[PDB]
Amino acid sequence: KIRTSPTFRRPKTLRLRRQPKYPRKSAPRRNKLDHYAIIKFPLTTESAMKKIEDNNTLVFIVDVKANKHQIKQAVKKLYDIDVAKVNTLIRPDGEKKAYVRLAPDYDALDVANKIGII
């Protein structure tokens, strides 16, 4: 073996992987951002009733740490309805408002009737 370059580099040694004899915590933590904890309550305001009636959407107050994907898959499990799109904003109250547009074959006010807002 010849030294082709005049630079000595550190040779790459074998790096083993972590094989601990005990887990550092006993149990994995429970997912506190549950599908019930992520959607708190909808708005029954007159600005949200026109939003429900005209644009075939629903308006929710969601958790502030929620993605649009999480809001989508949370509505799809609690209310058994698929989602066209989710548009979120953060209010000056501090709460996150979510406009959730349903599919064209599902009707948002007939979803709102069975959940309670009318």
Partner 1 sequence: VVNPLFEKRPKNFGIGQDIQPKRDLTRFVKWPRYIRLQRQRAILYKRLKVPPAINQFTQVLDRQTATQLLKLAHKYRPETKQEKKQRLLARAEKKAAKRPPVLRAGVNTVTTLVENKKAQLVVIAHDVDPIELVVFLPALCRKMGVPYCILKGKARLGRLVHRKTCTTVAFTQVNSEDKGALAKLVEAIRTNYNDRYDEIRRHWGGNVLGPKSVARIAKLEKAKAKELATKLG
Q: How far is the CB of 15 from RNA (least distance, A)?
A: 25
Stretch that binds RNA, among 1-9, 18-26, 33-41, 98-106 (CB under 7 A): 1-9
49, 57 contact by CB (below 8 A): no
| Exposure of 108 in the CB half-sphere (CA atoms within 13 A) | 23
Residue 116, both tokens: 């309670």
Residue 1 or 24: the one with the smaller Cβ distance to RNA is: 1
Q: How far apart are CA 90 and CA 64, in angstroms?
A: 8
Residue 16 binds which entry of RNA, partner 1, none, CB below 5-8 Å type-dependent: none
Closest separation in Å from C-beta 1 to partner 1: 10
Applying CB under 7 A, which of residues 7, 13, 19, 31 lies at the interface with RNA?
Answer: 7
Q: Are 37 and 70 in contact (CB under 8 A)?
A: no
Residue keyed to tokens 């989508």: 72
* Ranges within 2-21 binding partner 1 (CB under 8 A): 2-8
